[PDB]
Amino acid sequence: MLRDLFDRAVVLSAYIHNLSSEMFSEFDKRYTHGRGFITKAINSCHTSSLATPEDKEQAQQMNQKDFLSLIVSILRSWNEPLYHLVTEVRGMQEAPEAILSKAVEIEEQTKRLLERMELIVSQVHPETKENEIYPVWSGLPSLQMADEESRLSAYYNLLHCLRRDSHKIDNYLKLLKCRIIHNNNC
C-alpha cells in the first residue's frame, strides 16, 4: 500500500524538519546569538558533496529511482552525526533539556523514516542494486574540543546542516509522492 507508506513517510519527514528547526533556533538564541557563527556555517555540510537538485526543474529532471535512492543516501548519512549529537549532549552534566529532547526525538524518528523509505523502494523499485554510497560525516573531534568557541561553532554548523537537510528530505519526499502517486497532479 504505497499511499499509506508515502503518507506516513511525509508525516515523519515534515515533523523531523519541524523539530530540527526548533532545535537550531533554541541553540542559536541561547548559545551563539553573540557572534559570527553564521559566517563560519558557509559550505561546511557533510552532504554538500552529493549531487542534489536545487530547484523544481532539476528535481523534475531526475529519474525517480535515482531520486529515491538519493533521499535514502541523505538519511543514511545522518545516522552517525545524530547518534553522536545525542551521545555528546546526553553526557553533559548541565545538558540543555529542550535541545536534548528534540535531538533524541529526531534520532528515533529518522530511523522510522528510513524504514519507511526502504519499504517504499522495495515496493516501487524491487530490483535496485543494494549498495550504499553515502557521504561520511567525521566531525566528532570538533564537537569534543575543549575550546568553547570552536566547539559551539561545530555544534552550530551541525544543527544548521541538519535543519537544511531535513527540510530538503521533506521537500524531495513531497515531490516524489506527487510524482509517483498522482502523476504530478497533487
Binding site: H17, Q60, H167, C178, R179, N185, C186
Partner: protein
C-alpha cells in the same frame, strides 16, 4: 556635500520558493544617494554578482527571478549607497530562500449557506491558492486557516483547514452576518496576509 549614510537590507521574502525579493532602506544622517548597487555571492562559489532586476520589486529592491533563485544555499549580500561625495556599504546579509517563504493571500474566497434535509445545516467556505504556487508537483505545500466573526464580537473563531480548499462550519447564530477571511502558509514558513473579507447573512430559519 555629504556621502550617503549606511544603508540596510532589512527584509527578503519568497512568495513561492521559485523567486524572491529583497528590500533595503537608506541610512538617515548622510546625504542623498544617487545610485545603489546590490551585490552578492553564494555559498561554495567565489563569483560576485550584481542584483539581476532593480525594477520588478519597485523602490529600493532587488528581485531574483527563477534563473537566479535556488533553495538550500546561502546568499551573502550587500548594498552600497553612492553619490558624488562618496559611498557607504550595508552590513552583509546572509539569506537562505528556504527560510523566507511567505505566500500571497488565498484567492476567490466564496461562502454559501447549505440547508440539507435532516442532515445538520452548515456554512460552506471555498477558496483557491495564490497564483504561481506549484502545488501539483509537490514542490510547494500550502496549509490554510479561516477566521470568521460578526461585527462587534470581541473574538474571531479560527478554523485550521490543513491542505483543503473548502471547509464546513456548523452552528453559527441564526440571523447574524459574519465576516469571513482565509490565509495560508507554507508547510514551512510564514502566514500570508488575511484575504479581503467576504460577508454572509445566516438566514433566520437556520
Amino acid at each position: 556635500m555629504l556621502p550617503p549614510g549606511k544603508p540596510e537590507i532589512f527584509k527578503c521574502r519568497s512568495p513561492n520558493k521559485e523567486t524572491f525579493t529583497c528590500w533595503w532602506r537608506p541610512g538617515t544622517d548622510g546625504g542623498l544617494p544617487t545610485n545603489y548597487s546590490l551585490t552578492y555571492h553564494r555559498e561554495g562559489e567565489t563569483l560576485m554578482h550584481e542584483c539581476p532586476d532593480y525594477i520588478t520589486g519597485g523602490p529600493n529592491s532587488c528581485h531574483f527571478g527563477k534563473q537566479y533563485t535556488s533553495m538550500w544555499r546561502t546568499y551573502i549580500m550587500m548594498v552600497n549607497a553612492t553619490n558624488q561625495m562618496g559611498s557607504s556599504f550595508s552590513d552583509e546579509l546572509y539569506v537562505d530562500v528556504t527560510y523566507i517563504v511567505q505566500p500571497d493571500p488565498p484567492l476567490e474566497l466564496a461562502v454559501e449557506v447549505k440547508q440539507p434535509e435532516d442532515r445538520k445545516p452548515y456554512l460552506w467556505i471555498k477558496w483557491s491558492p495564490p497564483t504561481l504556487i506549484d502545488l501539483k508537483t509537490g514542490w510547494f505545500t500550502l496549509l490554510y486557516e479561516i477566521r470568521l466573526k460578526p461585527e462587534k464580537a470581541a473574538e474571531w473563531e479560527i478554523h485550521f483547514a490543513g491542505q483543503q480548499t473548502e471547509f464546513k462550519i456548523l452552528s453559527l447564530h441564526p440571523g447574524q452576518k459574519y465576516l469571513v477571511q482565509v490565509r495560508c502558509k507554507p508547510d514551512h514558513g510564514y502566514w500570508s496576509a488575511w484575504s479581503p473579507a467576504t460577508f454572509i447573512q445566516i438566514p433566520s430559519d437556520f
